[model samples]
Target: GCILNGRTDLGTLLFRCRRDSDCPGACICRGNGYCG
Candidate 1:
């Protein structure tokens, strides 16, 4: 398994967010409000 941001979770692929801090791990908030 791959480790991300300190854990081995799903990597916030479908999570919604408004900014970078809104997302966990290495995911960034996209313009669509989804974590990329």
Candidate 2:
């Protein structure tokens, strides 16, 4: 699962998640998924 810091700005989706133990970072999911 993933978490959102802030939805968007211009066209960006900021998301954070933990794919493994002791490793949690941020990224973008999709262009048409979630954002403003």
Candidate 3:
């Protein structure tokens, strides 16, 4: 259970663009929900 954990069913480890400065200004992980 990761992905957009702020809501939206919680849990999705597949996508793209894994890093956009930790995504906080409006989300950048339009693909791979990342944290590394």
Candidate 4:
């Protein structure tokens, strides 16, 4: 299953991920919060 979800706090962006392996494509729960 996909593991990439995101939201924005005003002008700031935020994200959460279940796990790196669960992430989609080459994306993962990056330290920046968003998937990468």
When 2 and 4 are scored with TM-score, the better candidate is 4
| lDDT by residue (tens digit), candidate 2, 1-36 | 333443333222232311122122243333344321
lDDT of 1: 0.50
Per-candidate TM-score against the hidden true structure: 0.33, 0.14, 0.20, 0.33
Off by over 4 Å in 3: 1-21, 32-36
Superposed by TM-score, candidate 4 places the C-alpha of residue 35 at a distance from the truth, in angstroms, of 1.3
lDDT of 4 by residue, 1-36 (tens): 233343222123235543454345456657765544
Least accurate stretch of 10 residues (summed lDDT) in model 1? 1-10
Evaluated against the true structure, the overall lDDT of model 3 is 0.39
Clashing pairs in 4: none
The residue pairs that clash in candidate 1, if any, are: none
lDDT, each prediction: 0.50, 0.30, 0.39, 0.43
The runs of at least 3 residues in candidate 4 whose Cα sits more than 4 Å from the true structure, single-residue gaps closed, are 1-14
lDDT leader: 1
Error of 2 at 34 (Å): 12
C-alpha RMSD (angstroms) for model 4: 7.0
lDDT of 3 by residue, 1-36 (tens): 334434322234223434544444444555444432
TM-score of predicted structure 4? 0.33
lDDT of 1 by residue, 1-36 (tens): 223453223345444554556445656567875655
